[PDB]
Amino acid sequence: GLNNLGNTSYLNSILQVLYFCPGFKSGVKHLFNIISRKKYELICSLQSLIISVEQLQASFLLNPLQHDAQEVLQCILGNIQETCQLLKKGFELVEKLFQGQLVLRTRCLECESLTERREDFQDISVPVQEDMKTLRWAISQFASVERIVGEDKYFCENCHHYTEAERSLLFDKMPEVITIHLKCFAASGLSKINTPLLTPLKLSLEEWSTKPTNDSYGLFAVVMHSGITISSGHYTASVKVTYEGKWLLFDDSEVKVTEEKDFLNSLSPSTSPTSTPYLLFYKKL
Amino acid sequence: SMQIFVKTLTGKTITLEVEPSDTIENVKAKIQDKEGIPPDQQRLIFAGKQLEDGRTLSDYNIQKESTLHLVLRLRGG
Amino acid sequence: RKVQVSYVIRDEVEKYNRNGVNALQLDPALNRLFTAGRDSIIRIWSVNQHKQDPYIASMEHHTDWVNDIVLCCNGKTLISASSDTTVKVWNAHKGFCMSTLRTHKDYVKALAYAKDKELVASAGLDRQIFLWDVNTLTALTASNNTVTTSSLSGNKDSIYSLAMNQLGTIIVSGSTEKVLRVWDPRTCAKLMKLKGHTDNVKALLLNRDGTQCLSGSSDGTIRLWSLGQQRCIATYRVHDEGVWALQVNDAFTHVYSGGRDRKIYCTDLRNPDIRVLICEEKAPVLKMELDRSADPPPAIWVATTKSTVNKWTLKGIHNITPLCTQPDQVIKGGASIIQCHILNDKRHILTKDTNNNVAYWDVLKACKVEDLGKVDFEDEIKKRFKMVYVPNWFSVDLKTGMLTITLDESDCFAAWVSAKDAGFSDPKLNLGGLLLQALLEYWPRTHVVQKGNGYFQVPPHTPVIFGEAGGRTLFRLLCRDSGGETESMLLNETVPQWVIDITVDKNMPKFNKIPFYLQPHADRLSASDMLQVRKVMEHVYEKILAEEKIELLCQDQVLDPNMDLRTVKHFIWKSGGDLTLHYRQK
Amino acid sequence: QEQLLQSTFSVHYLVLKDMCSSILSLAQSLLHSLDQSIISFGSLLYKYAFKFFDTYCQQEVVGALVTHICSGNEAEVDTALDVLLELVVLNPSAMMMNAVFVKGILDYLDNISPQQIRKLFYVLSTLAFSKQNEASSHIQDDMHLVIRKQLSSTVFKYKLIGIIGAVTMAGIMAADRLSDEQCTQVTSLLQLVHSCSEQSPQASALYYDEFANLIQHEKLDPKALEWVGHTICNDFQDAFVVDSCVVPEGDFPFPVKALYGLEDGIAINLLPLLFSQDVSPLCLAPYFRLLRLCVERQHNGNLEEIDGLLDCPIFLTDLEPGEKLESMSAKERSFMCSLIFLTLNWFREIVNAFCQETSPEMKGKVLTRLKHIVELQIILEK
Ligand SMILES: Cc1cnc(-c2ccccc2C(C)C)nc1NCc1ccc(-n2ccnn2)cc1
Ligand SMILES: [Zn+2]
Incomplete structure (x- = not known):
């Protein structure tokens, strides 16, 4: 009777991850109560689904088109944010959980003058192949110093000229949840890169931080995509319970529990997994 | 009028010359000229928000040295 | 690529630099100084103190920043590198460009010179280093214009500095690789890869025998290298900020350095403890030139990002408070236009320069209208505001x-x-x-005789430049020189079709239209953009003297009858849909 | 002729390689003709271009074939599918790199006949399971995902396509040349189709037909045949076969009796199921064909397990018209006509099952069943 779950596996994977995000359902019920006595449907529908899963999870413990997954998560978090800002006119669930701040630094190679931009971010989009690699290499391709030359020269306002420049990104403010959007797709013509990175269970972002910080991050949810093309496929999610310490493999209508070591080996690019990781979620320790 | 940055699929940064009045379809046409990716396949993320078709760069407060992020859709279901 | 037409609004003679100076060359025989300016003009100056006007000549053939110049062949030939991706050979005695080398694909930044072999190397942002023989280049003719190119290879990033020794047996390259690569120009073979710098290198030096190398980098350190040992034998941390210019004496024992920190130092190489602060400039130091007439050098010429070139005496270095406070000799510089605003008519521009003077310019007539002085630039923009919209055309x-x-x-x-x-x-x-016809007025191909568009004339000295969009300069000439024999053949080759249609074929461009549907205030129409409201007023009048009885409104605002729909759509409409005008009886 | 064409490509593929697009344009045009001789030559011009040219001209060959299948002409589609199957067999390695373009045909199944859908799933499945390298494992699981969502699609047309493809793939996975983990994968897929086709009777009938035709015309693994026999024999017995000791009960407006028996016994529960439709009885014949083929393969042509279904009675009413044909209502006559067809179809499939026996008393039972078919068919005319 639950063969229709697979038709919305993009939304199911996002909801499965959001369910186990520390404090997400704690914050949603707080907003639901506020909207309850105010008398918006997205918060109410979210609470009903969270209650429904709680009934299902308790029973499990006691009596044993096609859409992008990241895009759906973007719409859900964006709509939650707008409702929170409307409640202003607590209410910072999206800002505290998923929203951080980047400092983008440009250095002209002629005058050596520094210019900076401040931009918010909810996820970190990193490449998976250059054009065996690890996640640190991907963030280095994202945040380390890159030189823009040739057809991509920087226009310096100090020199009033097109000059070569160095661009570097730094993490100023860190959210509780770090989302890694993996560009497991390339262009010539669009194709899917089936070779994943070496995903680590521990992530330290001090290498690209404005200040030296001892805050480490631990992986707790992976959203994978199965298919040989980017136009269609299937989404699965593997979350971590914090049964605690085991990974839940949500596959349409079935749930599988595995050890942390077993799941890590399944993520190895050497074995050539069929499920290509697409979103990595890290929580602050 | 102003120059913005786009981080492409490989993480390499390119530059675009845009007006504050350009629509999102104009930026995507410029990105296709430099990257060869069809505009209907392009997703542009600025400051954690996806740029919606029909709006302009001034709607999103996109200024000089602002960085967009280019991704595609990994459809599933 | 698509060919663009560009021109410069300037005076016939630009005596002073209008931007910074990138390179310097000193001619000891004639006592002449060469300045490679950021205004794309090389100028010759007399360093004699008697002359109250040191200006001699202007060498104007480049179209972008001139990055390096070397004076070779006993001061008869000048080789120049520029941001327009060209290397050019000049007659330094007369001051005209003889030939242009187009082997580079990006900005050309560095020039190396070997006096004994008369060998010149050019390197740039395309990671290419090319070797040239000056005598071969100087002997080039219109008939014999072929040269065999010998290029060094192995550099994985853009070169910012280059160096050769006197004997022409060692060449060193500095780049953003943070390492120094050495070749042999005779055999075009790699020798070594010096490492130790942690940033881009912009200054390189070598001794006569070519076994010791001096380098300065953006990390703020000067490193002395030994080519025999392939190692850095000394490191000097003299400047607070990056080091951009280096100069050394004939004994190769004292190094003169300057950079972004604006301070110039004379450091003893055999022991870095003896450090003399020569001066503190008013701008970051881009290049320095030593006066090698006597030992020790009496003075040093300094080029900065400002348009002024100063000479500082070195009397008493070997005999913190700076040694000098005021420069001995000063070469005056002009002002650089730093801010620009195009007025609503798309014909006049208000500019502000480095002296804060505000000027009024006419693009159509390619001339300055009036000077306004130190007037507030933003206030002047509001003061000259007009209620009109013209589409952008330049x-x-x-x-x-x-x-x-x-x-x-x-x-x-x-x-x-x-x-x-x-x-x-x-x-x-x-x-x-109209502007294109005025720019190509002297071209015989545009004469059918009447000259030009019949309304205005750009100054005859206006430099007209033809080039590819984001590419190379196809052809450059003055407005008055189009009638010459050699220029006419070059114009036929380079002028694109879209300019031929208007200047030669005398065709008329398209007439754009805006579709607007009138609705009675409580039927789509298309017309010319410059159609006035009065014409729409009278059209309704025949549908139902016309000005007095009918009033038009848009977005609940009354419309000026003398105003046109182009202005209406841009200013009052404030919407993404087709223009809507409402007709109501007065 | 083919040998002249084969010799041309074999010894002069150096010169021909520089103009593969010219050859392919000629080949594509030749396939649009109406003569089999010209059509066969154009197919060979595709096959030889794929074999003797480089990687780029090979992708053009596959891309040209994909356009032929998505064209609309019946003859063009079947011929291009024949070339695709040939290219997979000769060069599976080169076709594994072109699987993305071959998979793209699944988006245009609306203008493809069910016969060509089965062939398209055959070339896709035989390509995915041709090798066991890591490249094949990606398409193997990708084909599984496409079918798992056609089976679960809301459209009935796509659900039937999923049944065809899943049975087609299961035949190639279970094809005898198989480890336990391979045997449980084909078992898992078959359970998925059986579960997804339970709701609709016509969709269920298609599953029984496709899976029976697979067993009859293909040789599967011995272990795979073991599981299918046990589940089909048990389910069919629990679905239709009932004990004759228990008399029928219900509100039937006609007397219910055991009819057409031969010579403590089992009987076919048919009339109550059809009246309850006012396992579906409409799938009684295709399901029994599946059961019979399963028992034959397990026991190597032996049918001692299902010997009781030949002589078992059938729960039927007094189907002889007792001068009440005019008085019969419109609903009753429609139910009466459907009653005859299902009983006739059941009798016809029994004759199919036991027509290969040798026992003299067995043959007389088959003859009696054949006589019943003739008698029932005459009664159907009334
Ligand atoms: C079959 C299934 C598929 N999706 C989800 C699900 C989960 C989270 C959020 C949203 C969803 C759905 C509604 C999209 N839940 C499922 N089943 C319930 C369940 C829950 C928890 C466990 N579990 C084991 C150990 N700790 N908790 C085991 C079973
Ligand atoms: Zn600069």
Whole structure:
């Protein structure tokens, strides 16, 4: 009777991850109560689904088109944010959980003058192949110093000229949840890169931080995509319970529990997994 | 009028010359000229928000040295 | 690529630099100084103190920043490198360009010279280093214009500095690799890869025998290298900020350095403890030139980002408080246009320069209208505000510190303006078409005889430049030189079709239309952009004297009858849909 | 002729390689003709271009074939599918790199006949399971995902396509040349189709037909045949076969009796199921064909397990018209006509099952069943 779950596996994977995000359902019920006595449907529908899963999870413990997954998560978090800002006119669930701040630094190679931009971010989009690699290499391709030359020269306002420049990104403010959007797709013509990175269970972002910080991050949810093309496929999610310490493999209508070591080996690019990781979620320790 | 940055699929940064009045379809046409990716396949993320078709760069407060992020859709279901 | 037409609004003679100076060359025989300016002009100066006007000549053939110049062949030949991706050979005694080398694909930044072999190397941002023989280049003719190119290879990033020794047996390259690569120019073979710098290198030196190398980098350190041992034998941390210029004496024992920190030092190489602060400049130091007439050098010439070139005496270095406070000799410089605003008529520009003077310019006539002085630039923009909209038809770049106006096929003819709105006494006029005919007025191919567009004339000395969009300069000439024999053949080859249609074929560009549907205030129509409201008023009058009985409104605002729909759509409409006008009885 | 064409490509593929697009344009045009001789030559011009040219001209060959299948002409589609199957067999390695373009045909199944859908799933499945390298594992699981969502699609047309493809793939996975993990994968897929086709009777009938035709015309693994026999024999017995000791009960407006028996016994529960439709009885014949083929393969042509279904009675009413044909209502006559067809179809499939026996008393039972078919068919005319 639950063969229709697979038709919305993009939304199911996002909801499965959001369910186990520390404090997400704690914050949603707080907003639901506020909207309850105010008398918006997205918060109410979210609470009903969270209650429904709680009934299902308790029973499990006691009596044993096609859409992008990241895009759906973007719409859900964006709509939650707008409702929170409307409640202003607590209410910072999206800002505290998923929203951080980047400092983008440009250095002209002629005058050596520094210019900076401040931009918010909810996820970190990193490449998976250059054009065996690890996640640190991907963030280095994202945040380390890159030189823009040739057809991509920087226009310096100090020199009033097109000059070569160095661009570097730094993490100023860190959210509780770090989302890694993996560009497991390339262009010539669009194709899917089936070779994943070496995903680590521990992530330290001090290498690209404005200040030296001892805050480490631990992986707790992976959203994978199965298919040989980017136009269609299937989404699965593997979350971590914090049964605690085991990974839940949500596959349409079935749930599988595995050890942390077993799941890590399944993520190895050497074995050539069929499920290509697409979103990595890290929580602050 | 102003120059913005786009981080492409490989993480390499390119530059675009845009007006504050350009629509999102104009930026995507410029990105296709430099990257060869069809505009209907392009997703542009600025400051954690996806740029919606029909709006302009001034709607999103996109200024000089602002960085967009280019991704595609990994459809599933 | 698509060919663009650009021109510079300037005076016939630009005596002083209008931007910074990138390179310096000193001629000891004639006592002449060469300055490679950021305004794309090389100038010759007399370093004699008797002359109250040191200006001699201007060497104007480049179209972008001139990055390096070397004086070779006993001061008879000058080799120049520039941001327009060209290397050019000059007659330094007369001051005209003889030939242009187009082997580079990006900005050319560095030039190396070997006096004994008369060998010159050119390196740039395309990671290419090319070797040239000056005598072969100087002996080039129109018939014999072929040269065999010998290029060094192995550099994985853009070169910012280059060096050769006197004997022409060692060449060193500095780049953003943070390492130094050494070749043998005779055999074009790699020798070594010096490492230790942690940033880009912009200054390189070598001794006569070519076994010791001096390098300065953006990390703020000067490193002395030994080519025999392939190692850094000494490191000097003298400047607070990056090091951009280096100079050494004939004994190769004292190094003169300057950079972004604006301070110039004389450091003893055998022991770095003896450090003398020569001066503190008013701008970051780009290049320095030593006066090698006597030992020790009496003075040093300094080029900065400012348009002024100063000489500082070195009397008493070997005999913190700076050694000098005021420069001995000063070469005056002009002002650079740093800010630009195009007025609503798309014909006049207000500019602000480095002296805070505000000037009023006429793009169509390619001349300055009036000087305003130290007036507030933003207030002057509001003071000259007009209630009119003209489509954009030109682009402005201030890379050389001067007004360069660029005309591209996409929007060159997008601005149609009635003669009454302009200052010409109403026939309907295209500003882009009129300007192109004035720029190519002297071209015989445009004569059918009448000369030009018949309304205005750009100054005859206006430099007209043809180039590819984001590419190379196809052809450069003055406005008055189009009638020459050699220029006419070059114009036939380079002038693109979209300019031929208007200047030669005398065709008329398109007439753009806006569709607007009238609705009675409580039927789609398309017309010319310069159609006045009065014409729409009278059209309704026949549908139902016309001005007095009918009033038109848009977005709940009354419309000026003398105003046109182009202005209406841009200013009052404030919407993404088709223009809507409402007709109501007065 | 083919040998002349084969010799041309074999010894002069150096010169021909520089103009593969010219050859392919000629080949594509030749396939649009109406003569089999010209059509066969154009197919060979595709096959030889794929074999003797480089990687780029090979992708053009596959891309040209994909356009032929998505064209609309019946003859063009079947011929291009024949070339695709040939290219997979000769060069599976080169076709594994072109699987993305071959998979793209699944988006245009609306203009493809069910016969060509089965062939398209055959070339896709035989390509995915041709090798066991890591490249094949990606398409193997990708084909599984496409079918798992056609089976679960809301459209009935796509659900039937999923049944065809899943049975087609299961035949190639279970094809005898198989480890336990391979045997449980084909078992898992079959359970998925059986579960997804339970709701609709016509969709269920298609599953029984497709899976029976697979067993009859293909040789599967011995272990795979073991599981299918046990589940089909048990389910069919629990679905239709009932004990004759228990008399029928219900509100039937006609007397219910055991009819057409031969010579403590089992009987076919048919009339109550059809009246309850006012396992579906409409799938009684295709399901029994599946059961019979399963028992034959397990026991190597032996049918001692299902010997009781030949002589078992059938729960039927007094189907002889007792001068009440005019008085019969419109609903009753429609139910009466459907009653005859299902009983006739059941009798016809029994004759199919036991027509290969040798026992003299067995043959007389088959003859009696054949006589019943003739008698029932005459009664159907009334
Ligand atoms: C079959 C299934 C598929 N999706 C989800 C699900 C989960 C989170 C959020 C949203 C969803 C759905 C509604 C999209 N839940 C499922 N089943 C319930 C369940 C829950 C928890 C466990 N579990 C084991 C150990 N700790 N908790 C085991 C079973
Ligand atoms: Zn700069």
